[PDB]
Amino acid sequence: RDESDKDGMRIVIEVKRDAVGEVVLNNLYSQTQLQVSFGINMVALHHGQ
DNA sequence: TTTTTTTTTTTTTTTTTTTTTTTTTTTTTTTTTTTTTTTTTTTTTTTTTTTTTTTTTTTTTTTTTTTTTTTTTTTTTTTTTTTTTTTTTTTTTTTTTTTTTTTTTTTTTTTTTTTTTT
DNA sequence: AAAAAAAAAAAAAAAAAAAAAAAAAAAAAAAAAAAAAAAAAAAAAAAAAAAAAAAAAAAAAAAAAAAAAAAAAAAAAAAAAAAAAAAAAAAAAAAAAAAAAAAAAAAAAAAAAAAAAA
Other Cβ atoms within 10 Å of A37 Cβ, number: 4
Distance of CA A26 to the CA centre of its chain: 11
- The amino acid that residue A47 corresponds to is H
- Round to whole Å and give the CA distance between A31 and A1: 19
The answer to whether the beta carbon of residue A43 comes closer than 7 angstroms to any atom of strand C is no
* A2 strand-pairing partners: A11
Chain centre to alpha carbon of residue A29: 7
Is-contact A10 A3, C-beta < 8 A?
A: yes
- Please check whether strand C approaches the CB of A4 to within 7 Å: no
Per the CB < 8 A criterion, the answer to whether A1 and A10 are in contact is no
Experimental determination approach used:
cryo-EM
Resolution in A for the shown PDB structure?
3.0
Residue type, A4: S
